[PDB]
Amino acid sequence: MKIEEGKLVIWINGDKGYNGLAEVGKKFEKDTGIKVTVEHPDKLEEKFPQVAATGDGPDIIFWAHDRFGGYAQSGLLAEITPAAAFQDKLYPFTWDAVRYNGKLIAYPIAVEALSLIYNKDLLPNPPKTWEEIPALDKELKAKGKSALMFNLQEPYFTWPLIAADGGYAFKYAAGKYDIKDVGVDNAGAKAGLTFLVDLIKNKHMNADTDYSIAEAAFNKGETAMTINGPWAWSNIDTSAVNYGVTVLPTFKGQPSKPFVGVLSAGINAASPNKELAKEFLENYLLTDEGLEAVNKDKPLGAVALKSYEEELAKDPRIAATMENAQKGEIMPNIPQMSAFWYAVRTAVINAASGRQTVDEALKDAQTAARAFAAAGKEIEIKKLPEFEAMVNAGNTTYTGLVEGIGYVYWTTETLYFIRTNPEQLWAIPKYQQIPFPYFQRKDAIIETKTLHTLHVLSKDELLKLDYDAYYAFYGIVEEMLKFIHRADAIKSYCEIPLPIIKSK
Amino acid sequence: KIEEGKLVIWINGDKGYNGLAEVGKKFEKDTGIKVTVEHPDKLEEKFPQVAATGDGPDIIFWAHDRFGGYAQSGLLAEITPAAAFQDKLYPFTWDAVRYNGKLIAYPIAVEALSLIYNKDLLPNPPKTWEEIPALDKELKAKGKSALMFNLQEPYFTWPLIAADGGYAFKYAAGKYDIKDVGVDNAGAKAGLTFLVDLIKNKHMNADTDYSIAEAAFNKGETAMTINGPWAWSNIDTSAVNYGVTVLPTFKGQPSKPFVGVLSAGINAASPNKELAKEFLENYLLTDEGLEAVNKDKPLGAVALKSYEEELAKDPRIAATMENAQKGEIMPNIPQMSAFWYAVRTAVINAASGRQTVDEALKDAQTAARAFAAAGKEIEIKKLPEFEAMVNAGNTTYTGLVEGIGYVYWTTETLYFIRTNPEQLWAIPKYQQIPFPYFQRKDAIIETKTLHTLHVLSKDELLKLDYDAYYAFYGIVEEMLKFIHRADAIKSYCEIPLPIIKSK
Amino acid sequence: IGDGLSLISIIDEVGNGEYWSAAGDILLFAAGKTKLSPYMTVISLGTWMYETDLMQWRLACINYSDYKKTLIKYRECHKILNSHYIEMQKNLGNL
Amino acid sequence: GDGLSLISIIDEVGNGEYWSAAGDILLFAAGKTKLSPYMTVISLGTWMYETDLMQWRLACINYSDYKKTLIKYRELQKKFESGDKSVEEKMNECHKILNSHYIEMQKNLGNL
């Protein structure tokens, strides 16, 4: 189904309760006459940005909130402002996940985050703090078992401990991320990573444990605790382990802070049915009976609607997901998170192995995250000869980091010239540059050349620059250079005052 | 994309492509470089599309007038023949391949209309237009007519209209002035007046078109026609004994046909420019080169003096060159579309008596100026359809709009700050901020793109100082951006900018 | 100055929310309004220039530049110099 | 000339000599497509380095912040003199904010 006025097409992933959502669409039809078509296309999160521009996307798209940042950056999602009472039905932190540069661009549906998963038979009383884990491991090691095994390779799993006392990826304030405020090398992250590394040095954990290793050990009854999300529950069910899910341990009295992913409902900017979409979502889906229909089909986990979450939370596994989510941090929806994952992944590996101190590892990662974040939305570094081969070929397309010198970017300006020898047809043209307004008598022959000027910034220089997640800093620089060129040139060309009409 | 070390040549299918290919084999034989000759359909429209993507042939052959648009888009390499080489070609042919002062192709061949006459009916064709009325009296008494040629298309009637002072766009030193149109001057009126009187006095029918005149001449029913070398083949087949000669004079001055100059241009994206230079200058533009092409299909008159002198032993070719030298090089600016569109209506209305010569040329002068100023595309859009565009936020159209004149758009980006970032459950509110825009990093910044509509009456548009080579709207936009920013930055901060002026 | 279509503006980015002028006193546009009046356009941009005014400026500047160039000679052609200045007021008086 | 910054590339290759605005310097000729930092600066006429620009924005922002804080101070001053007696401590606070901004401004202007 393509978008058609007077009806709704919804895209949602195949692993969600689409049948249940279809029932909600049928109640919407029966009450209002508006047909609702629920589709679960393959690769729908990548199809959407490709076709939404050409107006062949859905009215509504369900996906993880952090993907919606790119959609919103391209203007593909309708901005919503639901009524005060409607917003108050949902947990405030979930609304933060669907803000993009201050604008609400979707509706929160469900919530997921990591929790502490524990073996009740081995560990009836799971620890409330990380600090008691060493001692717990001594007791369990004397039984031929261990306290804790989780994926140490991926910062998604290790960052909850690291952030507990103050680490963060990018500072969030009022629906906006500041990519100039990275929290990778502050005192909180160092304390948390130091505790993570000491667990490894004192042999309570092994530096090479990954997702597969931890999963097998816990489901086989060999470790008392793992850290994982709701997607892992099914495999534990199949195993013989009597397991609980609970709040993650504190560190220095501070909650562990896992990243929070919010399933969210976005409205296509090109939809002619915006009001029908808001009506469907606010009065039919985001209600006890709406979410129940979906949950009944395939479980949503913890949900953003307070009244129905209190129903689901009678399951303590779901209550723990919501609690860790409320104590965690919203996954930033900006693509510069790529810089965060790349830098931090290396820091944990090097600190864990003793290649670097915790202090120097996070120092390096703080700097690396800053630079890649300033340089662009994804990790790309170019070898210097390979870049100089671009420049000497006249190729000015690359902007970003180049190994050895830092960041490169281009500003553009057009030069005008007048032919000085137009009567000499049997000769090489000679030209002379002319100032900004450029106006010459009609018989003059005017030639223009386009000038791409290369800029080189060291990483340190780059960081003092006003880089931003939402707007490229180089844009204003180019307009600044073009303006001052103009202002100087026009006084050179003609000092008669311009006939400017000035308002008010 | 264009393969290095090899030459790909595009030339039209009606030209001597096989002969050109054998000049290529001479080129391969000497240098080892293969030369491939292609004649794709509508190559003159394919070329801009594929050259822009850095693809296409290394060399394109076509009439010089089409190359003006190519050079406007930077699609043609600027060529550099030596001074002595240029004297091997007729000087006026080099004018045909200058664009805005730049030599951008090599002249190859020359075509223009001539007077074609039946030797049996008319051994001694008239030298003046003025003597054709009397000639028609005589031939009518023998059951014939003096003259039949296509009166529907201004290409064929323009030689008469221009003879006493008409021109399309004034030429001077490699540059056309699209503000200087010679359609309603006294010369153009005199010539067209003479055309319409021929029709009123029954010496010609205003409905006569190309196929009618062609049939009449090739059947022996009229003594003369005005046509070009593309028409000789059909006359050859008909077995009429025809001569080709200089067009008649009007008011003592020669008729001024448009001259098309077949030309070889080098693709700006070609990696093989010198190879292409070597081919054109050292193999093609020689007696032995042109002859090889000629033998396949005749080039007509040629730009190379040496080979033209051999060809001109044919008086038909000598006449084509003579009419070409006395004529007007076809202007290579794409705004010629305005000239053809306007002048076509004027001649037809005047010829049919629906309009006087004066009003028809006065109106065509105005329409040609207005359409040329508006752009390459002959389009006038009706006001409701344009307003339908505006009310949809569709800002793509630039050009004439019926009833209001010329429309164009200028663009500015607005920045705003959110004054409302922490207000509870509220409609976001914004306030515009001036040009540098730099705010604290906690501020929320929002940008809008603003397309402002401009309206010029035809009469306003005609007073502006623009040219064919640079759209005046572009500099207008940069002025508006400059003054917007000059005023804003004073509002943003009075601290002097750390500007480095070295020069 | 307020003709049917001149100086109306089109905004590409539709969004909720009120967009207020620089000084805070005029509401330029809100509520997903995407077409500005000529009056709102002039306030948003702050400055404007008419192409016909730019052309008199352009003529005056050329005439002035010519009189400066033909001056350095005599500063080492009256009718030229005075011809140039006369054409210059002719434009300036039309500003 | 710090080694690779301020070089320029010209898109349009062409023969012919392109001279500076004054007519004394040959910017490029004979199909040169790459200018040195020296020509770039001559053809462009004016320049600004990013680092100096950033100190300029800090100067302007801090000055803007000091003017705004001072407008609020006068509004509190109106209240105070008119009997409104609640604003006295927002007035003290508003004041040390005012000077912090001024000191930042001078630190920024000093860097220029």
UniProtKB/Swiss-Prot annotation, chain B:
One of its GO terms (cellular component) is ATP-binding cassette (ABC) transporter complex, substrate-binding subunit-containing. Its main location: periplasm. GO terms for biological process: carbohydrate transport; cell chemotaxis; detection of maltose stimulus; DNA damage response; maltodextrin transmembrane transport; maltose transport. It is found in: Periplasm. SUPFAM superfamilies: Periplasmic binding protein-like II. Induction: Induced by maltose and the transcriptional regulator MalT. Permanently repressed by cold shock in a PNPase-dependent fashion. It comes from the Bacteria. GO terms for molecular function: carbohydrate transmembrane transporter activity; maltose binding. Keywords: Periplasm, Signal, Sugar transport, Transport. It holds the Pfam family SBP_bac_1. The keyword Nucleotide-binding does not apply. Belongs to the bacterial solute-binding protein 1 family. Part of the ABC transporter complex MalEFGK involved in maltose/maltodextrin import. Binds maltose and higher maltodextrins such as maltotriose. PANTHER family: MALTOSE-BINDING PERIPLASMIC PROTEIN, MALTOSE_MALTODEXTRIN-BINDING PERIPLASMIC PROTEIN. The complex is composed of two ATP-binding proteins (MalK), two transmembrane proteins (MalG and MalF) and a solute-binding protein (MalE). NCBIfam families: PRK09474.1. This is Maltose/maltodextrin-binding periplasmic protein. It comes from Escherichia coli (strain K12). The lineage of its organism: Bacteria, Pseudomonadati, Pseudomonadota, Gammaproteobacteria, Enterobacterales.
